[PDB]
Amino acid sequence: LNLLVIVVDANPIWWGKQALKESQFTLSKCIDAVMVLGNSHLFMNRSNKLAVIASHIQESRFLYPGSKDGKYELLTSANEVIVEEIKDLMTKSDIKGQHTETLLAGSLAKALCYIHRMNKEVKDNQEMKSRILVIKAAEDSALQYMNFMNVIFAAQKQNILIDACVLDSDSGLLQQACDITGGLYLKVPQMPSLLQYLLWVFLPDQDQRSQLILPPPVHVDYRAACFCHRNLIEIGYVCSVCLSIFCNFSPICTTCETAFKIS
Amino acid sequence: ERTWEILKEDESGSLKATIEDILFKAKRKRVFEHHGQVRLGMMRHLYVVVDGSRTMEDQDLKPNRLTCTLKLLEYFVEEYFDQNPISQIGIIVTKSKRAEKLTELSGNPRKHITSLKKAVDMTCHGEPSLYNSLSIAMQTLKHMPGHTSREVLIIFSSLTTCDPSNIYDLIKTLKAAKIRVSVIGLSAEVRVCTVLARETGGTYHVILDESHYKELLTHHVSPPPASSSSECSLIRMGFPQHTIASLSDQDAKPSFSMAEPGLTLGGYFCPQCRAKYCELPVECKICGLTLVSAPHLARSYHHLFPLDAFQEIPLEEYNGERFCYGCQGELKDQHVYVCAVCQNVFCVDCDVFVHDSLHCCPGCIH
Amino acid sequence: ANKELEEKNRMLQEDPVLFQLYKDLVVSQVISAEEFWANRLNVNATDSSSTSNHKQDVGISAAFLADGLRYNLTSDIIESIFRTYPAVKMKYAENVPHNMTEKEFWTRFFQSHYFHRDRLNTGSKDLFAECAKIDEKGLKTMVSLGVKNPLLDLTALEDKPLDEGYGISSVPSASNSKSIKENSNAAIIKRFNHHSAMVLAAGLRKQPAVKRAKLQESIEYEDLGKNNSVKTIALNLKKSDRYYHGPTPIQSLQYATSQDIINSFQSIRQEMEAYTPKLTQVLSSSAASSTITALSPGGALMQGGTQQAINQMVPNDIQSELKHLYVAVGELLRHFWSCFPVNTPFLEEKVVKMKSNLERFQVTKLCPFQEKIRRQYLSTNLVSHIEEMLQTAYNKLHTWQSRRLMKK
Amino acid sequence: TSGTLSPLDIYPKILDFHPVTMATFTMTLARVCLCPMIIGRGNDQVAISSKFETREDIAVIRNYGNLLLEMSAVVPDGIVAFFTSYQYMESTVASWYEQGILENIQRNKLLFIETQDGAETSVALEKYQEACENGRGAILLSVARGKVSEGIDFVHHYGRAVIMFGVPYVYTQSRILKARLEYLRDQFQIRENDFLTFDAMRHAAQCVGRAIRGKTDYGLMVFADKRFARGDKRGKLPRWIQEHLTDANLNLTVDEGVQVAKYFLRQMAQPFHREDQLGLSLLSLEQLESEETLKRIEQIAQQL
Ligand SMILES: [Zn+2]
Ligand SMILES: [Zn+2]
Ligand SMILES: [Zn+2]
């Protein structure tokens, strides 16, 4: 038993520029691939289960869940709610600048707690394996690093594999999550053919990663910088009180009310 | 002459089938505790003291005290590193009016748990010597840097301990050394340990059940609070990047970690001494510079800014959506939780899992 | 020093080849001749970290000895007896076990005081506690206890303290009718009391605060008053945004123009308003096949890996020697760094490090001998990892020696 | 004013006195501090007692040694043992030493034996009190009649358990006792058996009464004598103590007492701080200004 949780970077800024750029690949083609991929997960196994969440500028909306019209049940109902939910979200869209980043951490938080409920809801005769697939397109928002790191470790503790697909702009945080969680980070070179990458890199089961031959994981440099002048640090000094990093020695924590006891 | 008649139907009519309904709260639990925005001993050197005396053979718990203790110790060791990889562990056993340092100062659960597995075969012998135990510990903590929270956790099974001199020698020394000592006692409260713990800045608690034993241990998993008497240091720390043998192992010989016998061709080098380390975080046994992975740092930042308990209510009287925010789903339970700031709708699992495991509220990130 | 010889044995016993290399380095000036051993010398304070607390068990610990007749296979046990009873200490020095076995002495130990607790000096090993009233004279006669006002003063609380026959006292031991049955009971009492009190004193010197402590401990009530409160420090973070953004270097992020934002919100909204899923938009065989080529085992996405194969020549010989070399070099650098990473610059550490590192210059000479095998016996191999560390060990001292601004 | 005397009905007779009030007060606690129990039944089913006119009966002495040995491992810090007579104490200790029981007790706690010498008393109490505070543990044994039961209060860690071996009857000096008993039959019409019970019970109540002096104090108390199981004797103990002397703990086996003790210790060794005491058993100024305090405390008083 498995539970795929798809995450799509519903960022109107990059996708809007992508739309304005009139490129060969657009959000329309993207959601098509997602729906086909989602269908494939359920299609691959009668017992498999699936959930989809869209990370927008201001909301983490669930895309599940199917329709009741009865033309076709399993795939059509899922696709119809997905189209309806993305349309509701994207058609009934506002315009904001004050808070322009994609709510990635909130979407991941929703997914993790949702997975927790589901895995508890599942009987213990057989247990629900789960993984998250993140499709990132916009820029990596550092302001969520705290939450992002905290949710990575929660996924790690919860033994959840996280995979990520990045379009254009890369992400140190997300690639680091793939490395830590044991998933895989891949920069797709041909966004119009996105679906074929998904159906091979991210679709194989957890029980098949080990059996398939796939692109080796890209080694992630753990570049770090202190809050003071943001320079890169390989060896620095850390406040044992607040763990604020400072590249060079100093008498007081610029990050907090604490004078170091220097000797 | 009461045990065969001890059922609820002994003197009641409806209890003939409602007995398990009248005594229905027989085996449940509901863990929660407080917190506080105070300095924490994030750098932690916690050492475990376990009775090795004949009294450890008693069956106060389900198995002998030894088996239940080692069972919960292994679990505690795991989560201790899991919640603080920066910290380190060491173990000392108090046997034959003597003390034996089961495990040295290290952060490797592999070796620590391996020692536990082997320690299952120990022989409970003689009376405990609290003085000898604290001697070996303090003798070791003397060399630890003042800013590193030097702490000891004691598990006491017996009631009498053989000290070669009044423990006030050690307590006066420990107090002056600002070392902190906490004690967990089995079935009883001992003045010695109570005075020792309360004076030293730790706490003395008594085991009631394996759940209570976990409940107490759980509290000891969280880093202790710190005062201005401890060194407010600006410790130097290394963040070495992993380096494989990319160039066909060229000019990069495989090497055993300072820590281990495993000869690793790739791994983390020491930016200070260029030593080879297959794992991280690892202390430079030949430099003193500790090396820690950037994510391990963030792994502890929740302790700096943890979540607050959500507003609990028996019904979504606020009339939010019938679907719980966060994890989507119906409010099937007549108890709801609402974040004080973002005020979204949260369920039982949200209040438990988000606050105890995610440590981040989704609506607060918005 | 002569004392260091006994303690250093641990290193040579555990690592014999490293000891041989350490001694070789000692002779080859790669390390100091003493340092080859002295680097392992360390000791405790007694038979244990803390004096053996033989305040319990004493001789009773061994049923006579290791055996009814007492065998002679106990040392620390009889040493605990020697520590427990100075009378036995005096006699144990007299009954020398040289050229004999303690079998007889361990058998005689069950005599009187130490096993049956009689009264007079029937002990098998002297008895200054035999005069148990004269042994107690420096405890509660000419001397006293340390709490004797605050407590333990029930000898003088009643109306009997002012005058004896003033009471209706008649119970106490008369000068008429004394008994030896009672002497046996009194001996057990006196022996157990004196033993407990004297043995306790060995661990309890113990104090001037005893009386005042017992007064305050019993006069003050933690129920009506005298709280207990903490004294940690409230952690008010400053510029918490730093943690929100995290310890990451500056990215290459850049904003666009408000027009681009407005158009982006509009264009995507309009696209999503006018959108329907289609199989042709889903995939094309050209896209899939091209992506398969990129993902193929020989495609652009198959980055460098598995380059860390087995060694170019004699991995086993290299690994065998490196084991010893890693232990030796590691143990050498250890001290060099311990001397170099000091809290302050001083000649006691600088010269000790400069000498140690100057010896390490002969260890690089000893590594040149270890380099010959890699450049001769081995067909092709690179031990540059150690060599780079060895170069760094000298480099660091040269860099520090250049810091003549009181740092060197 | 203290809570040691009972039954109050006998003192106006004995002292040929007539008080205005004959009241008693119930110990009011949110968490009991006392568990009086009568372990009158040995594990071997021997009726642990001194009913046999203090005659030499090894079987009860043996049972007394077994109880004390196991209880020494169960009770934390210090123990205080009271014998019915000094002779019996000496006779008993000699048997336990001869039977080796006493060595197993030493392994558990340091024994301190009392004697008429103020030097012994002062040294024993000195070493005992600090032994109860140092790493080790000590076990004081004395006589229910001697000054030790008078001058020393077993507060907190000192004497966390009080053990009364046998009913404290002084059958020695019977002539003087008879004379006073007879005179009490004459001018006061007081039955000798009734007075004897009272006289011993008040001594047991002294040891027990000195076992606790505060709310952050507690004491286990074993009455190792079948006699105590008689409704009359139990009924003549202090009513505030009888409240905890529930029938279920009468004539317990040694094992039952050990198990109940482990339970009682477990139930009270748990943290219970000053703030937790404000729920019940402690009233602040706010509660005093609350008339509830005026009505709630009425039931605390008792009368006899
Ligand atoms: Zn700070
Ligand atoms: Zn290093
Ligand atoms: Zn919130």
Short mmCIF file of N, CA, C and O in Angstrom, two decimals, chain B residues 197-283, unseen atoms left out:
data_model
loop_
_atom_site.label_atom_id
_atom_site.label_comp_id
_atom_site.label_asym_id
_atom_site.label_seq_id
_atom_site.Cartn_x
_atom_site.Cartn_y
_atom_site.Cartn_z
N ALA B 197 20.24 16.05 44.01
CA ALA B 197 19.66 16.59 42.79
C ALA B 197 19.21 18.04 42.97
O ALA B 197 19.55 18.91 42.16
N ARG B 198 18.44 18.32 44.03
CA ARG B 198 17.91 19.67 44.20
C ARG B 198 19.02 20.69 44.41
O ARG B 198 18.95 21.81 43.89
N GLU B 199 20.06 20.33 45.17
CA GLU B 199 21.17 21.25 45.39
C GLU B 199 22.00 21.44 44.12
O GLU B 199 22.42 22.56 43.80
N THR B 200 22.24 20.35 43.39
CA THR B 200 23.04 20.37 42.17
C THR B 200 22.31 21.02 41.00
O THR B 200 22.96 21.33 39.99
N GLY B 201 21.01 21.26 41.10
CA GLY B 201 20.31 21.91 40.02
C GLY B 201 19.50 20.98 39.15
O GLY B 201 18.84 21.44 38.21
N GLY B 202 19.54 19.68 39.43
CA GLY B 202 18.77 18.69 38.71
C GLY B 202 17.48 18.37 39.43
O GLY B 202 17.01 19.12 40.29
N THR B 203 16.89 17.23 39.08
CA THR B 203 15.64 16.84 39.71
C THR B 203 15.60 15.35 39.99
O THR B 203 16.11 14.54 39.21
N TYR B 204 14.99 15.01 41.13
CA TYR B 204 14.80 13.64 41.58
C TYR B 204 13.35 13.24 41.35
O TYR B 204 12.43 13.91 41.82
N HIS B 205 13.16 12.14 40.63
CA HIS B 205 11.86 11.59 40.32
C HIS B 205 11.88 10.09 40.58
O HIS B 205 12.94 9.47 40.63
N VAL B 206 10.69 9.52 40.75
CA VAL B 206 10.56 8.11 41.07
C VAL B 206 9.73 7.43 39.99
O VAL B 206 8.69 7.95 39.57
N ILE B 207 10.20 6.26 39.56
CA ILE B 207 9.49 5.46 38.57
C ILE B 207 8.26 4.81 39.19
O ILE B 207 8.32 4.27 40.30
N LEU B 208 7.15 4.88 38.47
CA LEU B 208 5.90 4.26 38.88
C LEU B 208 5.54 3.12 37.95
O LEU B 208 5.21 2.02 38.40
N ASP B 209 5.60 3.37 36.64
CA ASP B 209 5.28 2.39 35.62
C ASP B 209 6.23 2.61 34.45
O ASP B 209 6.90 3.65 34.37
N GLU B 210 6.30 1.63 33.56
CA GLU B 210 7.17 1.78 32.39
C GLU B 210 6.76 3.01 31.59
O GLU B 210 7.61 3.65 30.95
N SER B 211 5.48 3.37 31.63
CA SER B 211 5.02 4.58 30.95
C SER B 211 5.53 5.80 31.70
O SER B 211 6.07 6.73 31.10
N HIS B 212 5.40 5.77 33.03
CA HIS B 212 5.90 6.87 33.85
C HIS B 212 7.40 6.97 33.68
O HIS B 212 7.97 8.07 33.62
N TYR B 213 8.06 5.82 33.61
CA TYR B 213 9.50 5.76 33.39
C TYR B 213 9.86 6.44 32.08
O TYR B 213 10.81 7.22 32.01
N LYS B 214 9.09 6.16 31.02
CA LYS B 214 9.28 6.89 29.77
C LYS B 214 8.93 8.36 29.93
O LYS B 214 9.64 9.24 29.42
N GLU B 215 7.83 8.65 30.64
CA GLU B 215 7.40 10.04 30.84
C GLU B 215 8.50 10.85 31.50
O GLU B 215 8.76 12.00 31.12
N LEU B 216 9.16 10.26 32.50
CA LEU B 216 10.26 10.94 33.17
C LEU B 216 11.45 11.08 32.23
O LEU B 216 12.02 12.16 32.10
N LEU B 217 11.83 9.98 31.58
CA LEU B 217 12.93 10.03 30.62
C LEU B 217 12.66 11.06 29.54
O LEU B 217 13.57 11.78 29.11
N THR B 218 11.41 11.15 29.07
CA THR B 218 11.05 12.13 28.05
C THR B 218 11.48 13.54 28.45
O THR B 218 11.98 14.31 27.62
N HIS B 219 11.30 13.88 29.73
CA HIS B 219 11.64 15.22 30.20
C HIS B 219 13.14 15.46 30.09
O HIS B 219 13.59 16.57 29.77
N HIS B 220 13.94 14.43 30.35
CA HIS B 220 15.39 14.46 30.29
C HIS B 220 15.92 14.48 28.86
O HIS B 220 17.10 14.77 28.65
N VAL B 221 15.07 14.19 27.88
CA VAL B 221 15.46 14.31 26.48
C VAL B 221 15.62 15.78 26.10
O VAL B 221 16.56 16.15 25.38
N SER B 222 14.73 16.64 26.57
CA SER B 222 14.83 18.05 26.26
C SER B 222 16.05 18.67 26.96
O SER B 222 16.31 18.36 28.13
N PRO B 223 16.81 19.50 26.26
CA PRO B 223 17.99 20.11 26.87
C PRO B 223 17.62 20.86 28.13
O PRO B 223 16.52 21.43 28.25
N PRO B 224 18.52 20.89 29.11
CA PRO B 224 18.26 21.61 30.35
C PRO B 224 18.33 23.11 30.13
O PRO B 224 18.92 23.58 29.15
N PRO B 225 17.73 23.90 31.02
CA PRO B 225 17.90 25.35 30.95
C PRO B 225 19.26 25.76 31.50
O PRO B 225 19.89 25.06 32.29
N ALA B 226 19.70 26.94 31.07
CA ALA B 226 21.01 27.45 31.45
C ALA B 226 20.90 28.84 32.04
O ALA B 226 20.04 29.64 31.67
N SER B 227 21.81 29.11 32.97
CA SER B 227 21.96 30.37 33.68
C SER B 227 23.22 31.10 33.22
O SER B 227 24.05 30.56 32.49
N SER B 228 23.34 32.36 33.65
CA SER B 228 24.49 33.17 33.30
C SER B 228 25.76 32.71 34.01
O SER B 228 26.83 33.24 33.71
N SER B 229 25.66 31.74 34.92
CA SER B 229 26.86 31.26 35.59
C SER B 229 27.67 30.36 34.67
O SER B 229 28.89 30.25 34.83
N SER B 230 27.02 29.73 33.69
CA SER B 230 27.74 28.91 32.73
C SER B 230 28.43 29.82 31.72
O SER B 230 28.02 30.96 31.49
N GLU B 231 29.50 29.30 31.12
CA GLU B 231 30.22 30.06 30.10
C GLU B 231 29.34 30.34 28.89
O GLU B 231 28.90 29.42 28.20
N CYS B 232 29.07 31.62 28.63
CA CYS B 232 28.35 32.03 27.42
C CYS B 232 29.42 32.12 26.33
O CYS B 232 29.97 33.18 26.03
N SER B 233 29.72 30.97 25.74
CA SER B 233 30.82 30.91 24.79
C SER B 233 30.39 31.20 23.36
O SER B 233 29.21 31.30 23.01
N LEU B 234 31.42 31.34 22.52
CA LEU B 234 31.32 31.57 21.08
C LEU B 234 32.21 30.50 20.45
O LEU B 234 33.22 30.76 19.80
N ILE B 235 31.79 29.25 20.68
CA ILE B 235 32.55 28.08 20.25
C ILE B 235 32.78 28.05 18.75
O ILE B 235 31.87 28.28 17.94
N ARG B 236 34.02 27.74 18.39
CA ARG B 236 34.43 27.54 17.01
C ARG B 236 33.90 26.21 16.50
O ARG B 236 34.02 25.19 17.18
N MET B 237 33.30 26.23 15.31
CA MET B 237 32.69 25.02 14.78
C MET B 237 32.99 24.91 13.30
O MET B 237 32.99 25.90 12.57
N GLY B 238 33.25 23.68 12.86
CA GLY B 238 33.53 23.38 11.47
C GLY B 238 32.33 22.79 10.75
O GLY B 238 31.57 22.02 11.33
N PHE B 239 32.17 23.18 9.48
CA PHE B 239 31.06 22.72 8.65
C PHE B 239 31.60 22.08 7.38
O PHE B 239 31.26 22.50 6.26
N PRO B 240 32.47 21.07 7.50
CA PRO B 240 33.10 20.49 6.31
C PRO B 240 32.09 19.92 5.32
O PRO B 240 31.09 19.31 5.71
N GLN B 241 32.36 20.13 4.04
CA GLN B 241 31.53 19.60 2.97
C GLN B 241 31.97 18.18 2.63
O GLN B 241 33.17 17.88 2.64
N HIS B 242 31.00 17.32 2.35
CA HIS B 242 31.32 15.96 1.94
C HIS B 242 32.10 15.97 0.63
O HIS B 242 31.84 16.79 -0.26
N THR B 243 33.06 15.06 0.50
CA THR B 243 33.92 15.02 -0.68
C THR B 243 34.14 13.56 -1.05
O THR B 243 34.81 12.82 -0.33
N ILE B 244 33.57 13.16 -2.19
CA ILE B 244 33.71 11.81 -2.71
C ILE B 244 35.09 11.64 -3.33
O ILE B 244 35.86 12.61 -3.42
N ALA B 245 35.41 10.42 -3.76
CA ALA B 245 36.61 10.18 -4.56
C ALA B 245 36.20 10.35 -6.02
O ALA B 245 36.03 9.40 -6.78
N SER B 246 36.05 11.62 -6.42
CA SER B 246 35.49 11.93 -7.73
C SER B 246 36.49 11.71 -8.86
O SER B 246 36.13 11.18 -9.92
N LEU B 247 37.75 12.09 -8.66
CA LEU B 247 38.74 12.08 -9.74
C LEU B 247 39.40 10.72 -9.92
O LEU B 247 40.62 10.63 -10.07
N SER B 248 38.60 9.65 -9.90
CA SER B 248 39.12 8.28 -9.89
C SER B 248 40.04 8.04 -8.69
O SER B 248 41.10 7.42 -8.81
N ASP B 249 39.62 8.54 -7.53
CA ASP B 249 40.38 8.49 -6.28
C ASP B 249 41.76 9.14 -6.38
O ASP B 249 42.66 8.80 -5.61
N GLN B 250 41.96 10.06 -7.32
CA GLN B 250 43.29 10.59 -7.59
C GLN B 250 43.66 11.62 -6.53
O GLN B 250 42.86 12.52 -6.23
N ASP B 251 44.86 11.49 -5.97
CA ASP B 251 45.35 12.35 -4.89
C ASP B 251 44.41 12.38 -3.69
O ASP B 251 44.44 13.33 -2.89
N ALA B 252 43.56 11.36 -3.53
CA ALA B 252 42.61 11.30 -2.42
C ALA B 252 42.58 9.84 -1.95
O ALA B 252 41.74 9.05 -2.40
N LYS B 253 43.49 9.50 -1.05
CA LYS B 253 43.57 8.14 -0.55
C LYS B 253 42.43 7.85 0.43
O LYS B 253 42.00 8.73 1.19
N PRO B 254 41.92 6.62 0.43
CA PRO B 254 40.90 6.24 1.41
C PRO B 254 41.50 6.18 2.80
O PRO B 254 42.68 5.85 2.98
N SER B 255 40.69 6.51 3.80
CA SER B 255 41.22 6.53 5.16
C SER B 255 40.14 6.22 6.18
O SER B 255 38.96 6.52 5.98
N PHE B 256 40.57 5.61 7.28
CA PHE B 256 39.71 5.30 8.41
C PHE B 256 39.51 6.54 9.27
O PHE B 256 40.45 7.31 9.50
N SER B 257 38.28 6.75 9.73
CA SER B 257 38.00 7.89 10.58
C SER B 257 38.80 7.79 11.88
O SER B 257 39.13 6.70 12.34
N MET B 258 39.12 8.95 12.45
CA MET B 258 39.87 9.01 13.70
C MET B 258 39.14 8.31 14.85
O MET B 258 39.76 7.60 15.64
N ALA B 259 37.83 8.52 14.93
CA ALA B 259 37.02 7.88 15.96
N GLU B 260 37.06 5.42 13.74
CA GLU B 260 36.42 4.19 13.28
C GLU B 260 37.37 3.41 12.38
O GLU B 260 38.21 3.99 11.69
N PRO B 261 37.24 2.08 12.38
CA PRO B 261 38.13 1.25 11.55
C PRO B 261 37.73 1.21 10.09
O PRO B 261 38.52 0.71 9.27
N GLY B 262 36.56 1.72 9.73
CA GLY B 262 36.12 1.69 8.35
C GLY B 262 36.91 2.66 7.50
O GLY B 262 36.84 3.88 7.71
N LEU B 263 37.67 2.14 6.53
CA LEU B 263 38.46 2.97 5.63
C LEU B 263 37.54 3.52 4.56
O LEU B 263 37.11 2.79 3.67
N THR B 264 37.23 4.81 4.64
CA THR B 264 36.33 5.45 3.69
C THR B 264 37.13 6.23 2.64
O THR B 264 38.01 7.02 2.98
N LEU B 265 36.80 5.98 1.37
CA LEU B 265 37.43 6.69 0.26
C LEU B 265 36.87 8.10 0.12
O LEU B 265 37.59 9.01 -0.32
N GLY B 266 35.60 8.30 0.47
CA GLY B 266 34.99 9.60 0.43
C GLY B 266 34.34 9.91 1.76
O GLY B 266 34.07 9.01 2.57
N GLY B 267 34.10 11.19 1.99
CA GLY B 267 33.53 11.60 3.25
C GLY B 267 33.86 13.06 3.53
O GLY B 267 34.11 13.84 2.61
N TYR B 268 33.85 13.40 4.81
CA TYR B 268 34.13 14.75 5.26
C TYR B 268 35.56 14.83 5.78
O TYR B 268 35.98 14.02 6.60
N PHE B 269 36.29 15.82 5.28
CA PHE B 269 37.64 16.10 5.74
C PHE B 269 37.57 17.17 6.82
O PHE B 269 36.60 17.92 6.91
N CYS B 270 38.60 17.24 7.64
CA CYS B 270 38.63 18.27 8.65
C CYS B 270 39.22 19.54 8.08
O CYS B 270 40.36 19.52 7.61
N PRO B 271 38.50 20.66 8.10
CA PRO B 271 39.08 21.88 7.54
C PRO B 271 40.27 22.34 8.35
O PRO B 271 41.11 23.08 7.83
N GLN B 272 40.37 21.91 9.61
CA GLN B 272 41.47 22.25 10.50
C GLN B 272 42.67 21.31 10.34
O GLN B 272 43.81 21.77 10.24
N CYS B 273 42.44 19.98 10.31
CA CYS B 273 43.56 19.04 10.20
C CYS B 273 43.54 18.16 8.96
O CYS B 273 44.46 17.34 8.79
N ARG B 274 42.52 18.26 8.10
CA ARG B 274 42.36 17.45 6.89
C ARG B 274 42.13 15.97 7.19
O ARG B 274 42.26 15.14 6.28
N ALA B 275 41.81 15.61 8.43
CA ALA B 275 41.55 14.22 8.77
C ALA B 275 40.33 13.71 8.01
O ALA B 275 39.50 14.49 7.53
N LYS B 276 40.21 12.40 7.93
CA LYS B 276 39.13 11.76 7.19
C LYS B 276 38.07 11.31 8.18
O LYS B 276 38.39 10.69 9.20
N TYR B 277 36.82 11.62 7.88
CA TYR B 277 35.69 11.20 8.70
C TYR B 277 34.58 10.75 7.77
O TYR B 277 34.13 11.52 6.92
N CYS B 278 34.13 9.51 7.94
CA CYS B 278 33.06 8.97 7.11
C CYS B 278 31.69 9.51 7.52
O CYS B 278 30.82 9.68 6.67
N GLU B 279 31.50 9.78 8.81
CA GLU B 279 30.25 10.31 9.34
C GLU B 279 30.41 11.77 9.74
O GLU B 279 31.52 12.29 9.87
N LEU B 280 29.27 12.44 9.89
CA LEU B 280 29.17 13.76 10.47
C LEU B 280 27.87 13.82 11.25
O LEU B 280 26.88 13.20 10.84
N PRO B 281 27.82 14.54 12.38
CA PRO B 281 28.90 15.33 12.99
C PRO B 281 29.91 14.46 13.74
O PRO B 281 29.54 13.44 14.33
N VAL B 282 31.17 14.87 13.73
CA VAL B 282 32.25 14.17 14.43
C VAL B 282 33.18 15.19 15.05
O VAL B 282 33.55 16.19 14.42
N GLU B 283 33.57 14.93 16.29
CA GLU B 283 34.58 15.73 16.98
C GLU B 283 35.97 15.35 16.50
O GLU B 283 36.31 14.17 16.41
#
